PDB file of C-alpha atoms and ligand atoms in Angstrom:
ATOM      1  CA  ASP G   7     -13.460 -75.120-206.179  1.00 16.50           C
ATOM      2  CA  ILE G   8     -10.505 -77.387-206.002  1.00 17.40           C
ATOM      3  CA  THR G   9     -10.046 -79.144-202.594  1.00 16.65           C
ATOM      4  CA  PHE G  10      -7.325 -81.121-200.634  1.00 15.24           C
ATOM      5  CA  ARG G  11      -8.645 -82.750-197.821  1.00 12.78           C
ATOM      6  CA  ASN G  12      -5.956 -84.272-195.642  1.00  8.95           C
ATOM      7  CA  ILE G  13      -3.889 -85.241-198.403  1.00  9.78           C
ATOM      8  CA  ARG G  14      -0.873 -87.712-197.615  1.00  7.84           C
ATOM      9  CA  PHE G  15       1.219 -88.398-200.673  1.00  7.35           C
ATOM     10  CA  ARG G  16       4.426 -90.691-201.519  1.00  5.80           C
ATOM     11  CA  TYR G  17       5.113 -92.085-204.975  1.00  7.04           C
ATOM     12  CA  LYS G  18       6.024 -95.797-204.142  1.00  6.74           C
ATOM     13  CA  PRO G  19       5.059 -98.343-201.736  1.00  7.61           C
ATOM     14  CA  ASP G  20       7.886 -98.115-199.434  1.00  7.68           C
ATOM     15  CA  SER G  21       9.418 -94.502-200.451  1.00  9.15           C
ATOM     16  CA  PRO G  22       9.412 -91.437-198.261  1.00  5.59           C
ATOM     17  CA  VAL G  23       6.274 -89.304-197.646  1.00 10.44           C
ATOM     18  CA  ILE G  24       6.513 -86.141-200.265  1.00  8.01           C
ATOM     19  CA  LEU G  25       2.918 -84.503-199.220  1.00  7.44           C
ATOM     20  CA  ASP G  26       2.437 -85.109-195.594  1.00  5.55           C
ATOM     21  CA  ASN G  27      -1.340 -83.606-194.446  1.00  7.15           C
ATOM     22  CA  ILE G  28      -2.026 -80.968-197.201  1.00  6.70           C
ATOM     23  CA  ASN G  29      -5.041 -79.212-196.792  1.00  7.96           C
ATOM     24  CA  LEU G  30      -6.026 -76.695-199.443  1.00  6.02           C
ATOM     25  CA  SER G  31      -9.168 -74.868-200.645  1.00  3.38           C
ATOM     26  CA  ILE G  32      -8.636 -73.391-204.209  1.00  2.00           C
ATOM     27  CA  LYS G  33     -11.549 -71.235-204.644  1.00  2.00           C
ATOM     28  CA  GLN G  34     -12.981 -70.789-208.206  1.00  2.00           C
ATOM     29  CA  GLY G  35     -11.461 -67.965-210.280  1.00  2.00           C
ATOM     30  CA  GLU G  36      -8.729 -67.793-207.726  1.00  3.29           C
ATOM     31  CA  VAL G  37      -5.125 -67.153-209.268  1.00  3.38           C
ATOM     32  CA  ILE G  38      -2.814 -68.744-206.647  1.00  7.44           C
ATOM     33  CA  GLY G  39       1.047 -69.278-206.921  1.00  5.93           C
ATOM     34  CA  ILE G  40       2.701 -72.148-205.710  1.00  3.96           C
ATOM     35  CA  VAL G  41       6.335 -71.247-204.635  1.00  4.25           C
ATOM     36  CA  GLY G  42       9.158 -73.162-202.370  1.00  3.55           C
ATOM     37  CA  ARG G  43      12.424 -74.506-202.723  1.00  5.03           C
ATOM     38  CA  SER G  44      13.375 -77.158-205.182  1.00  2.79           C
ATOM     39  CA  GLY G  45      12.131 -80.719-204.188  1.00  2.00           C
ATOM     40  CA  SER G  46       9.513 -79.137-201.820  1.00  2.00           C
ATOM     41  CA  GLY G  47       6.434 -80.701-203.629  1.00  2.00           C
ATOM     42  CA  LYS G  48       5.077 -78.164-205.678  1.00  4.26           C
ATOM     43  CA  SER G  49       4.653 -79.966-209.157  1.00  6.22           C
ATOM     44  CA  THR G  50       3.655 -83.007-206.795  1.00  4.23           C
ATOM     45  CA  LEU G  51       0.900 -81.319-205.691  1.00  4.26           C
ATOM     46  CA  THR G  52      -0.627 -80.155-209.029  1.00  4.71           C
ATOM     47  CA  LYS G  53       0.148 -83.644-210.107  1.00  4.91           C
ATOM     48  CA  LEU G  54      -2.685 -84.818-208.035  1.00  2.59           C
ATOM     49  CA  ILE G  55      -5.060 -82.610-209.365  1.00  2.47           C
ATOM     50  CA  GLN G  56      -4.765 -84.544-212.977  1.00  4.49           C
ATOM     51  CA  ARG G  57      -5.014 -87.891-210.778  1.00  8.48           C
ATOM     52  CA  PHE G  58      -1.437 -89.535-212.393  1.00  7.06           C
ATOM     53  CA  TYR G  59      -1.575 -90.375-208.600  1.00  7.98           C
ATOM     54  CA  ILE G  60      -3.749 -91.150-206.125  1.00  5.99           C
ATOM     55  CA  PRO G  61      -2.974 -90.367-202.415  1.00  4.99           C
ATOM     56  CA  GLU G  62      -2.798 -93.086-199.434  1.00  5.43           C
ATOM     57  CA  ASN G  63      -4.923 -90.826-197.287  1.00  2.00           C
ATOM     58  CA  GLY G  64      -7.474 -88.004-197.373  1.00  2.00           C
ATOM     59  CA  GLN G  65      -9.168 -86.560-200.982  1.00  2.00           C
ATOM     60  CA  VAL G  66      -8.875 -84.471-203.813  1.00  2.00           C
ATOM     61  CA  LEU G  67     -12.200 -82.579-204.821  1.00  2.00           C
ATOM     62  CA  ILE G  68     -12.941 -80.532-207.999  1.00  2.00           C
ATOM     63  CA  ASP G  69     -16.157 -78.665-207.672  1.00  2.00           C
ATOM     64  CA  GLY G  70     -17.373 -80.724-205.084  1.00  5.06           C
ATOM     65  CA  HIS G  71     -16.653 -84.058-207.077  1.00  6.49           C
ATOM     66  CA  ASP G  72     -14.276 -86.659-205.695  1.00  7.60           C
ATOM     67  CA  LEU G  73     -11.496 -87.373-208.246  1.00 11.00           C
ATOM     68  CA  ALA G  74     -11.363 -90.934-207.167  1.00 10.23           C
ATOM     69  CA  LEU G  75     -14.774 -91.667-208.207  1.00  8.48           C
ATOM     70  CA  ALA G  76     -14.724 -88.915-211.456  1.00  7.13           C
ATOM     71  CA  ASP G  77     -14.919 -89.896-214.917  1.00  4.88           C
ATOM     72  CA  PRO G  78     -11.334 -89.578-216.277  1.00  4.49           C
ATOM     73  CA  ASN G  79     -12.705 -87.986-219.866  1.00  5.54           C
ATOM     74  CA  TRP G  80     -14.331 -85.382-217.516  1.00  5.85           C
ATOM     75  CA  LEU G  81     -11.172 -84.661-215.400  1.00  9.92           C
ATOM     76  CA  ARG G  82      -9.157 -84.052-218.570  1.00  8.71           C
ATOM     77  CA  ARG G  83     -11.587 -81.067-219.619  1.00  9.80           C
ATOM     78  CA  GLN G  84     -10.992 -79.484-216.458  1.00 11.59           C
ATOM     79  CA  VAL G  85      -7.195 -79.253-216.177  1.00  7.32           C
ATOM     80  CA  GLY G  86      -5.034 -77.494-218.543  1.00  8.72           C
ATOM     81  CA  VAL G  87      -1.251 -77.967-217.921  1.00  8.00           C
ATOM     82  CA  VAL G  88       1.862 -75.959-219.407  1.00  8.46           C
ATOM     83  CA  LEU G  89       4.162 -78.641-217.788  1.00  7.58           C
ATOM     84  CA  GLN G  90       7.898 -78.394-217.528  1.00  5.14           C
ATOM     85  CA  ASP G  91       9.840 -79.053-220.904  1.00  9.53           C
ATOM     86  CA  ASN G  92       6.008 -80.269-222.143  1.00 14.58           C
ATOM     87  CA  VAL G  93       7.725 -82.155-225.064  1.00 14.51           C
ATOM     88  CA  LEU G  94       6.008 -81.071-228.741  1.00 12.70           C
ATOM     89  CA  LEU G  95       5.675 -83.219-231.634  1.00 14.85           C
ATOM     90  CA  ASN G  96       7.143 -83.925-235.113  1.00 14.62           C
ATOM     91  CA  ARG G  97       4.643 -81.945-236.958  1.00 15.34           C
ATOM     92  CA  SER G  98       3.706 -78.361-238.157  1.00 13.92           C
ATOM     93  CA  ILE G  99       3.242 -75.351-235.842  1.00 13.53           C
ATOM     94  CA  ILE G 100      -0.655 -75.186-236.082  1.00 13.16           C
ATOM     95  CA  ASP G 101      -1.343 -78.806-235.183  1.00 13.21           C
ATOM     96  CA  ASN G 102       1.115 -78.589-232.198  1.00 13.57           C
ATOM     97  CA  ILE G 103      -0.975 -75.391-230.796  1.00 14.20           C
ATOM     98  CA  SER G 104      -4.321 -77.143-231.872  1.00 15.01           C
ATOM     99  CA  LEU G 105      -3.540 -80.737-230.019  1.00 13.65           C
ATOM    100  CA  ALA G 106      -6.650 -79.885-227.668  1.00 12.75           C
ATOM    101  CA  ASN G 107      -8.900 -80.140-230.946  1.00 14.62           C
ATOM    102  CA  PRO G 108      -7.747 -79.237-234.152  1.00 11.74           C
ATOM    103  CA  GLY G 109     -10.039 -78.372-237.466  1.00 11.80           C
ATOM    104  CA  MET G 110     -10.972 -75.435-234.905  1.00 12.69           C
ATOM    105  CA  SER G 111     -10.775 -71.952-235.038  1.00 11.44           C
ATOM    106  CA  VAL G 112      -9.342 -69.807-237.845  1.00  8.99           C
ATOM    107  CA  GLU G 113      -8.167 -66.761-236.053  1.00  9.39           C
ATOM    108  CA  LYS G 114      -8.638 -67.914-232.568  1.00  8.61           C
ATOM    109  CA  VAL G 115      -5.175 -69.925-232.465  1.00  9.31           C
ATOM    110  CA  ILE G 116      -3.964 -66.713-233.286  1.00 12.16           C
ATOM    111  CA  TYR G 117      -5.405 -65.087-230.527  1.00  9.81           C
ATOM    112  CA  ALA G 118      -3.572 -67.520-228.479  1.00 14.51           C
ATOM    113  CA  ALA G 119      -0.469 -67.207-229.984  1.00 16.60           C
ATOM    114  CA  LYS G 120      -0.909 -63.337-229.550  1.00 16.71           C
ATOM    115  CA  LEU G 121      -1.429 -64.130-226.121  1.00 15.32           C
ATOM    116  CA  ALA G 122       1.509 -66.054-225.283  1.00 17.56           C
ATOM    117  CA  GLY G 123       3.477 -63.896-227.630  1.00 18.28           C
ATOM    118  CA  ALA G 124       4.240 -66.173-230.105  1.00 20.24           C
ATOM    119  CA  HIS G 125       2.079 -65.086-233.033  1.00 18.89           C
ATOM    120  CA  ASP G 126       4.788 -62.297-233.683  1.00 21.30           C
ATOM    121  CA  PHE G 127       7.960 -64.529-234.415  1.00 21.74           C
ATOM    122  CA  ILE G 128       5.521 -67.122-236.296  1.00 19.20           C
ATOM    123  CA  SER G 129       4.932 -64.417-238.866  1.00 14.64           C
ATOM    124  CA  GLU G 130       8.374 -64.538-240.210  1.00 15.67           C
ATOM    125  CA  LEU G 131       8.933 -68.443-241.074  1.00 17.42           C
ATOM    126  CA  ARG G 132       8.804 -69.932-244.111  1.00 15.89           C
ATOM    127  CA  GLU G 133       5.159 -71.595-244.013  1.00 14.42           C
ATOM    128  CA  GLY G 134       4.137 -69.261-241.152  1.00 12.81           C
ATOM    129  CA  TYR G 135       1.816 -71.678-239.102  1.00 13.81           C
ATOM    130  CA  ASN G 136       2.063 -74.438-241.330  1.00 15.91           C
ATOM    131  CA  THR G 137       5.794 -74.422-240.772  1.00 17.21           C
ATOM    132  CA  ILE G 138       6.870 -78.335-240.253  1.00 14.00           C
ATOM    133  CA  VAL G 139       9.072 -78.887-236.955  1.00 13.49           C
ATOM    134  CA  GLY G 140      10.662 -81.765-235.505  1.00 12.31           C
ATOM    135  CA  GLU G 141      11.074 -83.829-232.154  1.00  9.11           C
ATOM    136  CA  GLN G 142      13.779 -81.264-231.136  1.00  9.59           C
ATOM    137  CA  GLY G 143      11.837 -78.287-233.278  1.00  7.82           C
ATOM    138  CA  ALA G 144      13.589 -78.115-236.694  1.00  5.15           C
ATOM    139  CA  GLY G 145      13.565 -74.515-236.136  1.00  5.65           C
ATOM    140  CA  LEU G 146      12.519 -73.843-232.560  1.00  5.88           C
ATOM    141  CA  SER G 147      14.380 -72.219-229.794  1.00  8.92           C
ATOM    142  CA  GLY G 148      14.007 -72.918-226.040  1.00  5.90           C
ATOM    143  CA  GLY G 149      11.626 -69.882-225.363  1.00  7.01           C
ATOM    144  CA  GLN G 150      10.061 -70.212-228.650  1.00  3.74           C
ATOM    145  CA  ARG G 151       9.124 -73.825-227.785  1.00  4.51           C
ATOM    146  CA  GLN G 152       7.679 -72.600-224.711  1.00  6.54           C
ATOM    147  CA  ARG G 153       5.684 -70.007-225.950  1.00  7.24           C
ATOM    148  CA  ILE G 154       3.875 -72.611-228.251  1.00  2.43           C
ATOM    149  CA  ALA G 155       3.174 -74.739-225.040  1.00  7.28           C
ATOM    150  CA  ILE G 156       1.484 -71.632-223.457  1.00  6.65           C
ATOM    151  CA  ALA G 157      -0.293 -71.447-226.999  1.00  6.96           C
ATOM    152  CA  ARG G 158      -1.239 -75.150-226.878  1.00  5.27           C
ATOM    153  CA  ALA G 159      -2.220 -74.931-223.010  1.00  3.89           C
ATOM    154  CA  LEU G 160      -4.409 -71.638-223.980  1.00  2.00           C
ATOM    155  CA  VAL G 161      -6.288 -73.175-226.684  1.00  2.00           C
ATOM    156  CA  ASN G 162      -7.568 -76.075-224.344  1.00  2.00           C
ATOM    157  CA  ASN G 163      -9.725 -73.360-222.963  1.00  2.00           C
ATOM    158  CA  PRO G 164      -9.803 -75.004-219.487  1.00  2.00           C
ATOM    159  CA  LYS G 165     -11.600 -74.453-216.308  1.00  2.00           C
ATOM    160  CA  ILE G 166      -8.470 -74.804-214.268  1.00  2.00           C
ATOM    161  CA  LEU G 167      -5.232 -73.847-215.793  1.00  2.00           C
ATOM    162  CA  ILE G 168      -1.691 -74.763-214.232  1.00  2.00           C
ATOM    163  CA  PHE G 169       1.367 -72.660-215.356  1.00  2.00           C
ATOM    164  CA  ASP G 170       4.277 -75.106-214.246  1.00  2.30           C
ATOM    165  CA  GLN G 171       6.778 -72.769-214.520  1.00  2.00           C
ATOM    166  CA  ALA G 172       6.165 -71.373-218.088  1.00  2.00           C
ATOM    167  CA  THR G 173       8.521 -68.403-218.268  1.00  2.76           C
ATOM    168  CA  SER G 174      11.715 -70.439-217.189  1.00  2.09           C
ATOM    169  CA  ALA G 175      13.329 -70.307-220.612  1.00  2.00           C
ATOM    170  CA  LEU G 176      11.905 -66.640-221.416  1.00  2.00           C
ATOM    171  CA  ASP G 177      13.789 -63.041-221.194  1.00  2.87           C
ATOM    172  CA  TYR G 178      12.448 -60.576-219.256  1.00  2.67           C
ATOM    173  CA  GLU G 179      10.570 -58.941-221.978  1.00  4.72           C
ATOM    174  CA  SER G 180       8.828 -61.756-223.305  1.00  8.11           C
ATOM    175  CA  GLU G 181       8.196 -62.781-219.615  1.00  5.95           C
ATOM    176  CA  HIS G 182       6.768 -59.263-219.068  1.00  6.82           C
ATOM    177  CA  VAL G 183       4.655 -59.640-222.219  1.00  5.85           C
ATOM    178  CA  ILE G 184       2.828 -62.651-220.768  1.00  3.98           C
ATOM    179  CA  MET G 185       2.283 -60.988-217.514  1.00  2.00           C
ATOM    180  CA  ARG G 186       0.607 -58.016-219.117  1.00  2.00           C
ATOM    181  CA  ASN G 187      -1.523 -60.533-220.535  1.00  2.00           C
ATOM    182  CA  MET G 188      -2.088 -62.317-217.456  1.00  2.00           C
ATOM    183  CA  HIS G 189      -5.849 -60.384-217.031  1.00  2.00           C
ATOM    184  CA  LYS G 190      -7.197 -61.923-220.160  1.00  2.00           C
ATOM    185  CA  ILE G 191      -5.381 -65.577-219.871  1.00  2.00           C
ATOM    186  CA  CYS G 192      -7.059 -65.864-216.284  1.00  2.00           C
ATOM    187  CA  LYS G 193     -10.660 -64.025-216.989  1.00  2.00           C
ATOM    188  CA  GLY G 194     -13.309 -66.423-215.843  1.00  2.00           C
ATOM    189  CA  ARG G 195     -10.991 -69.612-215.031  1.00  2.00           C
ATOM    190  CA  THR G 196      -8.975 -70.874-211.937  1.00  2.00           C
ATOM    191  CA  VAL G 197      -5.302 -70.804-212.442  1.00  2.00           C
ATOM    192  CA  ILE G 198      -2.485 -72.187-210.726  1.00  2.00           C
ATOM    193  CA  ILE G 199       1.076 -70.683-211.203  1.00  2.00           C
ATOM    194  CA  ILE G 200       4.442 -72.506-210.103  1.00  2.00           C
ATOM    195  CA  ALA G 201       7.097 -70.108-210.008  1.00  2.00           C
ATOM    196  CA  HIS G 202      10.730 -69.658-209.158  1.00  2.00           C
ATOM    197  CA  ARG G 203      10.665 -66.316-210.836  1.00  2.00           C
ATOM    198  CA  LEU G 204       8.998 -64.823-208.140  1.00  2.00           C
ATOM    199  CA  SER G 205       7.940 -61.896-210.185  1.00  2.00           C
ATOM    200  CA  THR G 206       5.157 -64.302-212.124  1.00  2.00           C
ATOM    201  CA  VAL G 207       3.527 -64.400-208.844  1.00  2.00           C
ATOM    202  CA  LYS G 208       3.409 -60.718-207.771  1.00  2.00           C
ATOM    203  CA  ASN G 209      -0.092 -60.070-208.758  1.00  2.00           C
ATOM    204  CA  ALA G 210      -1.682 -63.339-207.729  1.00  2.00           C
ATOM    205  CA  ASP G 211      -4.657 -63.614-205.277  1.00  2.00           C
ATOM    206  CA  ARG G 212      -2.928 -65.885-203.011  1.00  2.00           C
ATOM    207  CA  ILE G 213       1.053 -67.049-202.824  1.00  2.00           C
ATOM    208  CA  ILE G 214       1.135 -70.605-201.108  1.00  2.00           C
ATOM    209  CA  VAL G 215       4.575 -71.283-199.672  1.00  2.00           C
ATOM    210  CA  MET G 216       6.179 -74.938-199.728  1.00  2.00           C
ATOM    211  CA  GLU G 217       8.831 -76.647-197.380  1.00  2.00           C
ATOM    212  CA  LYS G 218       9.248 -80.276-197.369  1.00  2.00           C
ATOM    213  CA  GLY G 219       5.717 -80.968-198.599  1.00  2.00           C
ATOM    214  CA  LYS G 220       4.038 -78.828-196.110  1.00  2.00           C
ATOM    215  CA  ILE G 221       2.160 -75.442-196.697  1.00  2.00           C
ATOM    216  CA  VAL G 222       4.537 -72.983-194.684  1.00  2.00           C
ATOM    217  CA  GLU G 223       3.154 -69.666-195.430  1.00  2.00           C
ATOM    218  CA  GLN G 224       0.622 -67.903-197.112  1.00  2.00           C
ATOM    219  CA  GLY G 225      -0.587 -64.555-198.275  1.00  2.00           C
ATOM    220  CA  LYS G 226      -0.002 -61.955-201.088  1.00  2.00           C
ATOM    221  CA  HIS G 227       3.031 -60.832-202.308  1.00  2.00           C
ATOM    222  CA  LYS G 228       3.265 -57.319-200.510  1.00  2.00           C
ATOM    223  CA  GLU G 229       1.827 -59.260-197.122  1.00  2.00           C
ATOM    224  CA  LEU G 230       4.506 -62.268-197.338  1.00  2.00           C
ATOM    225  CA  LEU G 231       7.401 -59.465-198.256  1.00  2.00           C
ATOM    226  CA  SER G 232       6.442 -57.233-195.236  1.00  2.00           C
ATOM    227  CA  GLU G 233       7.121 -60.001-192.740  1.00  2.00           C
ATOM    228  CA  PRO G 234      10.910 -60.379-192.701  1.00  2.00           C
ATOM    229  CA  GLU G 235      11.052 -63.475-191.022  1.00  2.00           C
ATOM    230  CA  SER G 236       8.916 -65.305-193.584  1.00  2.00           C
ATOM    231  CA  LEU G 237      10.965 -67.786-195.962  1.00  2.00           C
ATOM    232  CA  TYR G 238       9.089 -66.089-198.821  1.00  2.00           C
ATOM    233  CA  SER G 239      10.751 -62.646-198.201  1.00  2.00           C
ATOM    234  CA  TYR G 240      14.211 -64.413-197.534  1.00  2.00           C
ATOM    235  CA  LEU G 241      13.911 -66.055-201.200  1.00  2.00           C
ATOM    236  CA  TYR G 242      12.969 -62.695-202.346  1.00  2.00           C
ATOM    237  CA  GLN G 243      16.032 -61.288-200.787  1.00  2.00           C
ATOM    238  CA  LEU G 244      18.596 -63.459-202.616  1.00  2.00           C
ATOM    239  CA  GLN G 245      17.944 -62.455-206.145  1.00  2.00           C
ATOM    240  CA  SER G 246      19.867 -59.689-207.413  1.00  2.00           C
ATOM    241  CA  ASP G 247      22.349 -58.967-204.404  1.00  2.00           C
TER     242      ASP G 247
HETATM  243  N1  ATP C   1       8.690 -89.508-209.826  1.00  2.00           N
HETATM  244  C1  ATP C   1       9.045 -89.804-208.783  1.00  2.00           C
HETATM  245  N2  ATP C   1       9.354 -90.893-207.944  1.00  2.00           N
HETATM  246  C2  ATP C   1       9.732 -90.676-206.791  1.00  2.00           C
HETATM  247  N3  ATP C   1       9.831 -89.639-205.914  1.00  2.00           N
HETATM  248  C3  ATP C   1       9.631 -88.169-206.774  1.00  2.00           C
HETATM  249  C4  ATP C   1       9.200 -88.389-208.065  1.00  2.00           C
HETATM  250  N4  ATP C   1       8.981 -87.042-208.344  1.00  2.00           N
HETATM  251  C5  ATP C   1       9.512 -86.255-207.348  1.00  2.00           C
HETATM  252  N5  ATP C   1       9.883 -87.178-206.564  1.00  2.00           N
HETATM  253  C6  ATP C   1      10.493 -86.693-205.187  1.00  2.00           C
HETATM  254  O1  ATP C   1       9.301 -85.639-204.809  1.00  2.00           O
HETATM  255  C7  ATP C   1       9.879 -84.475-204.135  1.00  2.00           C
HETATM  256  C8  ATP C   1       9.712 -83.033-204.561  1.00  2.00           C
HETATM  257  O2  ATP C   1       9.310 -83.227-206.172  1.00  2.00           O
HETATM  258  P1  ATP C   1       8.674 -82.206-206.705  1.00  2.00           P
HETATM  259  O3  ATP C   1       8.895 -82.178-208.420  1.00  2.00           O
HETATM  260  O4  ATP C   1       7.059 -82.095-206.571  1.00  2.00           O
HETATM  261  O5  ATP C   1       9.357 -80.888-206.379  1.00  2.00           O
HETATM  262  P2  ATP C   1       9.159 -79.214-207.006  1.00  2.00           P
HETATM  263  O6  ATP C   1       8.860 -78.397-205.533  1.00  2.00           O
HETATM  264  O7  ATP C   1       8.327 -79.298-208.189  1.00  2.00           O
HETATM  265  O8  ATP C   1      10.768 -79.334-207.044  1.00  2.00           O
HETATM  266  P3  ATP C   1      11.377 -78.311-208.462  1.00  2.00           P
HETATM  267  O9  ATP C   1      11.559 -77.118-207.557  1.00  2.00           O
HETATM  268  O10 ATP C   1      12.993 -78.791-208.226  1.00  2.00           O
HETATM  269  O11 ATP C   1      11.052 -78.598-209.948  1.00  2.00           O
HETATM  270  C9  ATP C   1      11.414 -84.674-204.231  1.00  2.00           C
HETATM  271  O12 ATP C   1      11.783 -85.176-203.070  1.00  2.00           O
HETATM  272  C10 ATP C   1      11.666 -85.591-205.558  1.00  2.00           C
HETATM  273  O13 ATP C   1      12.587 -86.397-205.163  1.00  2.00           O
END
């Protein structure tokens, strides 16, 4: 379980309130999508699960434990994040993917790659997985980088997986390949999906809709879509005109 109890958050002392009174209970094993306008508070919400920031009011709880008194080491074993851009390092591919403990798993890093749809193009490279990449990937293209980051997050094997717009740099096919693998990706873990590409959330158990820091609507894709006055339906309406 993940719990937000009466959460109020602003980044700085004098600064404006970003999250005003958030109450959310992510059940264990739930696949939940978070959508909403740019600047609505989606990634800020997820920042508080990792405790980069602590709220001025209310509490965040993971499986009963209060995060403000939790062990920081323990917390980082719970949460795995495919971040925005999610900067890599100036070394080989295997060490990038194997950041969450290397010297670990011969053919299972490959499994993570296959799941991310990265194993395919990795084959053709000069030293394969031992291919040395740079700061701005001496080799890597945008969507190729991104799939490495998905491979990295999966290798973690976290109880909670934050999928922070992790198909933003991919073609519809690379995305479609990952979505077919989502069932394996999610199997026996809690998955939060931040999406502006609403098709990444079609099959989520629950879509939560954010506006100006508040959870305004919730429901399954079909249910939200069949309410013609919903903000979600209006957003889905706009793509492809
Ligand atoms: N580090 C920060 N310091 C101060 N304010 C911030 C910071 N990060 C974000 N904000 C403010 O928090 C609000 C929401 O930001 P957040 O990134 O959570 O929104 P989002 O829904 O993820 O946006 P996006 O769809 O553009 O990625 C915005 O008004 C933003 O200006």
